[PDB]
Amino acid sequence: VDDVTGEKVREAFEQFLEDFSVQSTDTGEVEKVYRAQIEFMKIYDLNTIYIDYQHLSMRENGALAMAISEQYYRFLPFLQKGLRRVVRKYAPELLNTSPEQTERVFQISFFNLPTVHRIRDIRSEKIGSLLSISGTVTRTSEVRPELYKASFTCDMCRAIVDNVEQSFKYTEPTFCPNPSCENRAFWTLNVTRSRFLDWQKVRIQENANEIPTGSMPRTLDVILRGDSVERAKPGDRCKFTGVEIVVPDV
Amino acid sequence: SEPLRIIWGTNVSIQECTTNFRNFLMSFKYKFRKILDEREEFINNTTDEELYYIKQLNEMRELGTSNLNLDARNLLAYKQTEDLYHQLLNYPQEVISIMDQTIKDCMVSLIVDNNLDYDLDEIETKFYKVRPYNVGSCKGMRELNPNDIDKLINLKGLVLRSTPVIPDMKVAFFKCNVCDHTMAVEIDRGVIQEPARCERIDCNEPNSMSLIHNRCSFADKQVIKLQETPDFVPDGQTPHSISLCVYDELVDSCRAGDRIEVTGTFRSIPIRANSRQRVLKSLYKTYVDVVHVKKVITDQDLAKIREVAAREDLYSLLARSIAPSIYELEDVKKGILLQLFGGTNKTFTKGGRYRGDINILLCGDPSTSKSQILQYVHKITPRGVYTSGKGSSAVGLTAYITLVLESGALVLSDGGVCCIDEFDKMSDSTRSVLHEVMEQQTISIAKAGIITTLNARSSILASANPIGSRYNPNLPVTENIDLPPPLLSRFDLVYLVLDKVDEKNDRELAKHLTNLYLEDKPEHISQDDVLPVEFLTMYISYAKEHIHPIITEAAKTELVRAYVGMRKMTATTRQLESMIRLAEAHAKMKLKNVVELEDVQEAVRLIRSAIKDYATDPKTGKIDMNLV
Amino acid sequence: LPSIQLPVDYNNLFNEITDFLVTFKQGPKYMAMLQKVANRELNSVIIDLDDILQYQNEKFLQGTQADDLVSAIQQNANHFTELFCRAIDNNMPLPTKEIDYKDDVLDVILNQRRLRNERMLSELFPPNLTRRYFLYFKPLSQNCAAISSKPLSVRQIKGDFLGQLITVRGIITRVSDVKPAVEVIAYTCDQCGYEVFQEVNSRTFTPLSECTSEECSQNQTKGQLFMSTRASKFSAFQECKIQELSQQVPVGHIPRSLNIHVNGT
Amino acid sequence: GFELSKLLQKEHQMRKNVIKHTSARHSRFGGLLSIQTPDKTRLTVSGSQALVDEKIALQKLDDSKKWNKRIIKAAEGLPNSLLNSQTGKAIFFTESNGKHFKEFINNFIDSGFNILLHSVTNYFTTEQDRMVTLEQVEYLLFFAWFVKYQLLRSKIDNSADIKQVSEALKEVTFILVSSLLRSAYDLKNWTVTHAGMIAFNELLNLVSRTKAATDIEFIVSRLFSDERIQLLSNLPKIGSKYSLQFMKSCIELTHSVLKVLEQYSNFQKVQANYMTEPVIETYINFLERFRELEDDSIKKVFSFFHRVFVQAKEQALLFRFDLIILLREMLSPDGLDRMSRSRKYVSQFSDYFLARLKKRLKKSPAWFVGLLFPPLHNSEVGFYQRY
DNA sequence: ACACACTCTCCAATTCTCTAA
DNA sequence: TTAGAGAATTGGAGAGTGTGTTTTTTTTTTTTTTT
Ligand SMILES: Nc1ncnc2c1ncn2[C@@H]1O[C@H](COP(=O)(O)OP(=O)(O)NP(=O)(O)O)[C@@H](O)[C@H]1O
Ligand SMILES: [Mg+2]
Ligand SMILES: [Zn+2]
Ligand SMILES: [Zn+2]
Ligand SMILES: [Zn+2]
């Protein structure tokens, strides 16, 4: 089964990346800033791209921006698939990170959203949407490696399983792929073939000047990944953006 | 004839309830409630004939809002719903749902019948809820019994604390692992009804679906801790508390220290012995499931307020009415009134913010009725606290580390009046806390694991007796009061009250106090003309909200002249600011937008009158008792 | 596995109980109370042992032998709460006044269940589910007197007394607030539309999860059971603690205490 | 972006459908409901919406029951193609790639199609006995694709012409496609039977095009000798067991076949050959999976039902209960969209259906028990039963 | 020993196929 | 064209086996001995 909305969003975001076509800061000449940003990333071997929400708002009567805003969690993989094709088209050197080279894990980023919420305004109706939040940092954790994609090999026979997906808990295969063997136990994680990500926990509290009458400040936990770890500092004031999620009891 | 729907174990038919509530909703008019009221003479024929709830529904449509209040007594007025009232109390869960679906259908019927422009899809999308209240007599917290389970209840109490919002699941989302088929599933009775096999026809496989957490749908839940009010506690015991569960709209309504009345079903549930197995314990937990919360405007109100403000004797009328039964002490009452009104809050783009609140100290001989006045101030104010000197610690007065921070008295009293009695008994260590809060109206904390600043817009009303426990005329006034200068400097008004013997005064006082015992529950009152407490509260609240005076050039000249006169001779910089703040408070009480020469002179006069300056020897600082 | 003889036969004592409830007078005393119970006016019955002693003496003076029921219910007090309840249920008179019977959910449920059985045919439920009253014993007057009349301090309550009816003197230390406790639990089967009950005595229990009804089974209807509060039976519960007087503590010792349970009115 | 926005409107409609079955108050607030039948027997259901909606209560009551009857299942040995995959799923092109591919196959058709098909078809007539399944399925799905594409292109624009694909009609290729379908059907090789079905469908469509403009009528008369009518009438009956694509191929072929013989003016003999129970069984079995199907196939199905019910006046076939369930499912707010063109046809059919059913049931009350079961084939009572 | 998770085994319910009237 | 006799495939009833469980601050109110 296939989701038509995802593919249409994918290949519309493709067109946005191709031909946003804003004119120059100084002259009436089409500049195509995001293709230039891809070229910049190619020059410096970067792995993240920044997008302005105002630019997305004016595109195609705002429907694409609405779809990205209200259902970010559904549509994030399709945006990645859309960006991969464009970077292949114009800068195939960026797709790889001598022996073979693994693929680059691109990151899309947004900024200049319409409004900033407080920690006190987080409510369960907004789960999975795109938001921005501000507060004071109070604690930070050390950087840890998070397992992103896994690969295992069977003990009782020479067989390999690859590209297992994790989500919130450490997860392992269900069968031995070789039908000559039935052992489910004694898997081992191949650290070389598997892939990891950088991961950091930080903790924030409300701004002091905003606290209502007779109340006390609430707190929140925030996750940082990729090239943004160790950017925050305790005691500083910061502004965040992302999506709020829900974490189980593992 | 046909199958029927019956509430389980009742033989109550849902059709009758639906039709009766529809008729009530679409034909009730307020006149019937006045028939049940004491007199038909109250009836306003023009207004009371109107269809009340149709008006409410039109307002709900055009304001884009979802919830309807309903005081249950109207069900008794309309003849067709007399029995529905009892059924509501006995079977809340089914009846309230019936009422909800009735209201939504009526809202649709209005637009389609009256053929209006409003989007039908929008109304179909929304949820509509009824919220009954004023159900009946309130019930003591300790007197709820097991025969009250699942019936509607009404409680009064005070709010201790509230937990943060908890996400509560309502809809589950499944996805097929192999073929990527998806299904949404309804949650009822707390159990997820997972499918046995993937429902796609060609992918009919077992164990093939799986849950996706962050694509589910959730709802807000919160738990509030309610404490028994002292009026009901048994003799020689301490108050108890009960827990309230609240959802969706009413989540973040209430803060610590609030005083409320609620309405909700009284529920009970089991609890497990261990998390591994289905073994339950014999004792059941109990809690309350609230559906409405209440705190314990019209042109006629504005007309009454404006008409009262035009009276010549307004200033004396308001002052003598805050504490009717207390004899004389007029200046003390006037100062307390000006504390109640308060100044104006000023904030700059740079250079800070300046307090509007007034601090008062009452000092003098015993038996002079200071604490009785503190009782009146404690009960008049919307928010506030009463406490004693020996009952207060430094932590309890401000804030408490428990890792979480917790509020003290001055924080709970934010925006109100904090009454402190036996002020002279608390130690210098405890009293040193009040410097920062009085000056800045903020509380700074720096302890292990917590460092922050909190706001405290709190007014202090203090009571004390002099050193030696009776005023000694052979010592100067500052030595009798005995508070250190850094703390005494922070009060706007300081009162001396003295137990001076005089036959003229004594006969009037004795006749006043003895008259209260001529009746079992006295009707007698000190003065012919006083305002009721409700209307006085309305006046003060409106004047606080709407009026914001500003200084005038004539007022500038008088303030400079008066401050220089008192200073040139001890008066300090704080005397000027307190004078401005008192003049602002005086201006609000007359509903003026400008502070004027009269207000400044009144503020000066009251400051001079409070500390008995006219009777004070200007050089030695002692008071001639003969001049009192 | 083994067995013994004992001097007591409960049939004779049951006969004595049912005679005592219908005969004794200071009409008979307790039939008035049971009439008030039937009228829904009264919630509890308090049995005096002074009445039983007087009854025994009067029966003896009439020239007939009788078992000493007083000592019998002091020695093994727990069993006789059930015997008296069964006797009361057997002998309960009919109401004197209209009641508005439809206010009771259990009446409607049991009437419908009986009608279902009647149609099907073209113990049912535990008797505890319909006992609208409580029952207590009151000890012997000491001035007529037996151990139940003589107070004991908390130290004198040895392990010999387990099972007996006694009296204790002391100071209360703490009291809990009231909460409900289950006695009979009610369920509903979704597919076959049939109700079943469960009785709870121990501190914990396992709820039912399968409809084992014979009709439901023979239709092979593996339906699901769900709990219901609206037809369950609760009873009020409270727990306290009592402690010996300080002026009775022997030298060098620490005071002792006992746990008290309270149910009903 | 425009079509994406329209699709988001459709998503909102589905969201609205979920909302209309969603309770206002939370999941543990719910009370309990009891429903009493005739004969005073009572049932129990939970949930707040059951209190008000009897339809939802009746559906929810049956939904709890555990059992489902286990189910029966046709092709293997060939990579993925139209024969064994749902082809409502495109593959996606760049603008340059789209125009380049269009240019390639357009030049192919205008240049190469006739010469290639003549050579390869006059090969296989001399080599049919030696064939393997690959070459049969290859030939039959090359034929179909290019004929269909030329028909659509000339439907669109006048610059194209139908003469570019005209080699398909000449007699040898017609004989060969016929022979492949024949031999595949006899040996019960169902994959080649499917592919031959698709090819023979396109030949009939092309004939109906050319008659709308000499030898083509001769080719028709030879295409509809009685033997071929026996085969083409036999085909939908066996389709009941097979995958969804097989039944759809049968339906579209049947539509084309009957329409061509409609425009021949024999007809009454041929139509009576088609109308009987097992064909109607296939049609209903196909129709109940409407959630996966196109807008057009349902139009074809209800065209056939109009033919059976109104024109031929063989009303007795459709008085069978599993059709009456389907019209409830398809016509409810559950299924077909309130504004799709399907609802016009469906409601206009159901009105007449229930009118005639009312008449029949009041004239003869025995049909109440009749509606559950198949019709009864006894000589003496069956004739009055059917009419 | 008392609820659970998981494995193993046998038996009969069901559909498919062939034969003759 | 119906139907009935024989063979093959599948479901889950239910019986069996193994398993797990009890159980150095830092902040704040109060009594006590020590300078
Ligand atoms: N002017 C007065 N009007 C009314 N009651 C008065 C007045 N003067 C004294 N009383 C009575 O005298 C008592 C004074 O009690 P109280 O309120 O404690 O005075 P106080 O100022 O608090 N003295 P103290 O607590 O020793 O510092 C009360 O019973 C009053 O009713
Ligand atoms: Mg006092
Ligand atoms: Zn293996
Ligand atoms: Zn699937
Ligand atoms: Zn059952």
Side-chain angles (χ1 to χ4, degrees), chain B residues 450-507:
Chain B
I450 296 184
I451 174 164
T452 186
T453 56
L454 310 172
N455 290 287
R457 291 143 291 210
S458 305
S459 311
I460 295 180
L461 171 59
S463 156
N465 292 350
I467 187 65
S469 198
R470 199 173 185 85
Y471 189 84
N472 193 345
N474 293 336
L475 291 173
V477 51
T478 184
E479 192 153 22
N480 270 288
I481 292 162
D482 203 20
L483 293 176
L487 179 53
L488 182 58
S489 178
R490 283 169 157 77
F491 285 93
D492 294 290
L493 289 170
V494 176
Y495 280 90
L496 294 182
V497 293
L498 301 173
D499 186 14
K500 189 70 167 67
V501 173
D502 163 56
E503 54 265 19
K504 301 292 191 183
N505 170 84
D506 292 356
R507 285 205 307 118

Side-chain angles (χ1 to χ4, degrees), chain A residues 2 4-5 8-9 60 74, chain D residues 1 3-4 7-8 11 89:
Chain A
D2 295 299
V4 176
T5 59
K8 290 198 182 302
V9 167
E60 290 169 25
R74 171 155 79 148
Chain D
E3 64 182 30
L4 171 52
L7 184 62
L8 290 179
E11 288 282 67
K89 170 174 173 175

Side-chain angles (χ1 to χ4, degrees), chain D residues 314 316 360 367 375-387:
Chain D
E314 312 293 352
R360 177 53 53 89
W367 264 104
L376 190 56
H377 300 264
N378 168 253
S379 52
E380 60 173 45
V381 290
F383 177 75
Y384 178 71
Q385 168 172 109
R386 269 174 171 162
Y387 301 88

Side-chain angles (χ1 to χ4, degrees), chain D residues 77-351:
Chain D
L78 220 31
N80 295 301
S81 58
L82 286 64
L83 305 195
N84 53 269
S85 70
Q86 211 286 310
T87 195
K89 170 174 173 175
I91 213 165
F92 307 103
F93 279 64
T94 77
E95 288 75 30
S96 54
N97 280 5
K99 245 63 196 170
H100 277 321
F101 189 72
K102 237 199 75 162
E103 282 290 343
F104 172 58
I105 41 163
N106 200 108
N107 282 286
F108 182 89
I109 286 167
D110 291 320
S111 192
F113 183 70
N114 300 289
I115 175 55
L116 189 61
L117 197 76
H118 184 77
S119 178
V120 63
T121 204
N122 297 124
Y123 186 116
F124 284 159
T125 46
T126 73
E127 211 81 348
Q128 176 164 219
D129 59 328
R130 294 162 170 185
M131 275 194 151
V132 179
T133 187
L134 184 80
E135 305 186 353
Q136 297 169 317
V137 169
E138 263 160 12
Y139 188 55
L140 298 166
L141 298 192
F142 160 73
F143 188 107
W145 205 92
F146 283 99
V147 174
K148 168 160 44 161
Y149 172 83
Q150 191 71 356
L151 290 199
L152 198 139
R153 197 165 63 93
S154 274
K155 167 65 171 186
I156 278 283
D157 189 51
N158 311 81
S159 183
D161 306 292
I162 306 303
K163 286 292 196 186
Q164 310 299 56
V165 299
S166 193
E167 165 59 355
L169 293 186
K170 316 308 283 288
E171 185 166 36
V172 180
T173 304
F174 133 82
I175 291 174
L176 183 52
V177 177
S178 294
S179 178
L180 268 329
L181 175 51
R182 171 68 72 191
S183 181
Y185 176 55
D186 284 12
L187 276 74
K188 315 298 168 68
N189 186 4
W190 300 117
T191 309
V192 181
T193 296
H194 197 177
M197 207 186 301
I198 302 169
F200 202 88
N201 182 21
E202 290 297 341
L203 198 166
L204 262 153
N205 212 335
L206 178 61
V207 162
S208 83
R209 205 71 169 196
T210 55
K211 214 183 192 186
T214 54
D215 310 317
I216 285 59
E217 292 83 307
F218 185 73
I219 289 151
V220 158
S221 71
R222 296 174 39 70
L223 272 156
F224 284 78
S225 48
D226 190 293
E227 305 166 9
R228 299 155 187 278
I229 314 309
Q230 184 133 236
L231 173 47
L232 275 82
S233 304
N234 186 283
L235 209 45
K237 295 173 183 177
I238 64 186
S240 185
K241 307 153 186 173
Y242 292 80
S243 70
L244 170 52
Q245 265 73 33
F246 199 102
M247 300 188 292
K248 204 172 83 77
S249 295
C250 285
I251 283 168
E252 298 202 40
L253 171 55
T254 297
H255 183 209
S256 289
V257 167
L258 279 157
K259 200 159 73 183
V260 172
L261 293 187
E262 194 197 345
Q263 59 170 233
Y264 115 108
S265 168
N266 298 87
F267 183 59
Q268 266 51 50
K269 297 287 193 179
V270 170
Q271 177 145 249
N273 202 283
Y274 265 106
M275 287 174 182
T276 168
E277 194 71 38
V279 165
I280 292 288
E281 184 62 28
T282 70
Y283 272 61
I284 284 156
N285 275 252
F286 167 86
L287 185 61
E288 96 189 349
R289 294 184 68 170
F290 67 97
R291 291 176 210 289
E292 315 185 14
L293 307 181
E294 310 294 345
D295 290 325
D296 212 80
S297 295
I298 281 83
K299 150 168 157 57
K300 260 165 267 291
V301 166
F302 279 103
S303 181
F304 184 76
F305 280 165
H306 188 260
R307 188 108 66 164
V308 163
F309 205 67
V310 162
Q311 294 191 31
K313 300 209 78 173
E314 312 293 352
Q315 279 143 226
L317 289 322
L318 307 184
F319 297 162
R320 30 176 290 148
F321 210 72
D322 59 354
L323 176 54
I324 285 179
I325 306 174
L326 177 61
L327 298 172
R328 115 179 267 271
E329 291 189 351
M330 175 178 294
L331 188 50
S332 170
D334 160 82
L336 285 175
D337 177 67
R338 286 185 181 178
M339 277 299 310
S340 168
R341 295 181 175 278
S342 192
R343 265 190 184 261
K344 295 286 202 75
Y345 257 31
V346 172
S347 197
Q348 197 270 302
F349 178 62
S350 292
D351 274 310

Side-chain angles (χ1 to χ4, degrees), chain B residues 89-103:
Chain B
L89 275 77
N90 294 345
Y91 309 103
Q93 296 158 249
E94 291 78 351
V95 171
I96 290 170
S97 303
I98 291 161
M99 290 174 175
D100 296 339
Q101 278 287 359
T102 308
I103 291 159

Side-chain angles (χ1 to χ4, degrees), chain C residues 30-42:
Chain C
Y30 290 95
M31 300 303 297
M33 299 188 74
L34 297 190
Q35 258 293 342
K36 287 184 180 181
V37 169
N39 295 344
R40 309 286 279 270
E41 302 178 49
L42 179 64

